[PDB]
Design an enzyme around this catalytic site. Structure first.
Site, PDB file in Angstrom:
ATOM      1  CG  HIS A  15      -0.390  -0.286   2.515  1.00 53.07           C
ATOM      2  ND1 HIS A  15       0.065   0.690   3.378  1.00 53.07           N
ATOM      3  CD2 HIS A  15      -0.226  -1.462   3.161  1.00 53.07           C
ATOM      4  CE1 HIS A  15       0.511   0.124   4.484  1.00 53.07           C
ATOM      5  NE2 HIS A  15       0.342  -1.182   4.380  1.00 53.07           N
ATOM      6  CG  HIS A  40       3.975   5.643   5.196  1.00 58.93           C
ATOM      7  ND1 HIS A  40       3.979   5.518   6.567  1.00 58.93           N
ATOM      8  CD2 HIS A  40       2.799   6.231   4.871  1.00 58.93           C
ATOM      9  CE1 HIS A  40       2.840   5.988   7.050  1.00 58.93           C
ATOM     10  NE2 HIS A  40       2.112   6.430   6.042  1.00 58.93           N
ATOM     11  CG  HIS A  99      -0.314   8.408   1.858  1.00 57.36           C
ATOM     12  ND1 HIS A  99      -1.010   7.227   2.016  1.00 57.36           N
ATOM     13  CD2 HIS A  99       0.265   8.670   3.053  1.00 57.36           C
ATOM     14  CE1 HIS A  99      -0.887   6.815   3.266  1.00 57.36           C
ATOM     15  NE2 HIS A  99      -0.107   7.666   3.909  1.00 57.36           N
ATOM     16  CD  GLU A 132      -3.373   9.305   3.478  1.00 52.70           C
ATOM     17  OE1 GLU A 132      -2.919   9.346   4.632  1.00 52.70           O
ATOM     18  OE2 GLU A 132      -3.882   8.281   2.979  1.00 52.70           O
ATOM     19  CG  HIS A 142       1.727  10.270   6.703  1.00 49.97           C
ATOM     20  ND1 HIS A 142       0.625   9.537   6.319  1.00 49.97           N
ATOM     21  CD2 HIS A 142       1.381  11.571   6.561  1.00 49.97           C
ATOM     22  CE1 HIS A 142      -0.339  10.357   5.942  1.00 49.97           C
ATOM     23  NE2 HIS A 142       0.090  11.595   6.085  1.00 49.97           N
ATOM     24  CB  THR A 184      -4.698   7.762   6.771  1.00 48.08           C
ATOM     25  OG1 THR A 184      -3.432   7.401   6.206  1.00 48.08           O
ATOM     26  CG2 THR A 184      -4.581   9.066   7.571  1.00 48.08           C
ATOM     27  CB  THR A 185      -3.520   2.356   6.215  1.00 48.75           C
ATOM     28  OG1 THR A 185      -2.528   2.500   7.240  1.00 48.75           O
ATOM     29  CG2 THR A 185      -3.041   3.083   4.969  1.00 48.75           C
TER      30      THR A 185
HETATM   31 ZN   LIG Z   1       0.385   7.511   5.906  1.00 47.64          ZN
END
Ligand SMILES: [Zn+2]
EC number: 4.2.1.1
Length: 257
Positions: free
Chosen positions: A61, A91, A93, A103, A116, A195-196
């Protein structure tokens, strides 16, 4: 199993993780004119000088750089936080195009990507225990826009070829995450969630106002990653972002005037 596609994406997550419709979900839109300056907030303390990176990993992801969190080496404190938070991993996004990917949003503005840096509260001993607490994690969120290259990101970009597919990892030692920070530590802060999945409501969010610039070539390398494992139909890892969630009964505070 959960992902970002039409049939398993964010709109589906609540079925396995009902907290997805909870009272303090992330990300959110940051309305800059409603966020109130809070003079009682302390400056952020970001102490990354002794950070020990271990591995870089495609987890299906995102890609993740992991750190040795077995001592107080790279820690976050101050700001809205009580106590000491250890850096575990960072990580990103990102989007399929530069106009989406972040996000959090700022006055509905979407950035090309969002970094993040995930820290856990040392008073809970390990990250597994921390995610079960309302103040267990602090995540430092940094926006990416496309322009000039970020030199401190290049070592990350150049190893993504070696972890194209889910489950691949590589040695990634001596990486200095200070090279990913913008000049200003001005921030917004609010109580939120992962957020996951499992979307646990355990995060104090600290979102920096100043984005870092990365080059088109750098973000293009993000977009060559795969959601899929090796030998499965290739599905580019792009648009791995959860959209903004209802703010509900929360206030976003600003560290700056
Ligand atoms: Zn994140």
């Amino acid at each position: 199993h959960w992902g970002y596609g039409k049939h398993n994406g964010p709109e589906h997550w609540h079925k396995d993780f009902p907290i997805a419709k909870g009272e303090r979900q992330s990300p959110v839109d940051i309305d800059t004119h409603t966020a109130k300056y809070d003079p009682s907030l302390k400056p952020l303390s970001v102490s990354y000088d002794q950070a020990t990176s271990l591995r870089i990993l495609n987890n299906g992801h995102s890609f993740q750089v992991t750190f040795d969190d077995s001592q107080d080496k790279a820690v976050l404190k101050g700001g809205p936080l009580d106590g000491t938070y250890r850096l575990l991993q960072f990580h990103f996004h990102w989007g399929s195009l530069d106009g989406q990917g972040s996000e959090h949003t700022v006055d509905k503005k979407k950035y090309a990507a969002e970094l993040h840096l995930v820290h856990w509260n040392t008073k809970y001993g390990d990250v597994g225990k921390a995610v079960q607490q309302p103040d267990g994690l602090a995540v430092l969120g940094i926006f990416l826009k496309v322009g000039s290259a970020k030199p401190g990101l290049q070592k990350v970009v150049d190893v993504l070829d070696s972890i194209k597919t889910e489950g691949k990892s590589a040695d990634f030692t001596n990486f200095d995450p200070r090279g990913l920070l913008p000049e200003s530590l001005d921030y917004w802060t609010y109580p939120g969630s992962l957020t996951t999945p499992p979307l646990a409501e355990c995060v104090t969010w600290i979102v920096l106002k100043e984005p870092i610039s990365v080059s088109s070539e750098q973000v293009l390398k993000f977009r060559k990653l795969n959601f899929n494992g090796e030998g499965e139909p290739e599905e580019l890892m792009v648009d791995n972002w959860r959209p903004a969630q209802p703010l509900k009964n929360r206030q976003i505070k600003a560290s700056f005037k």
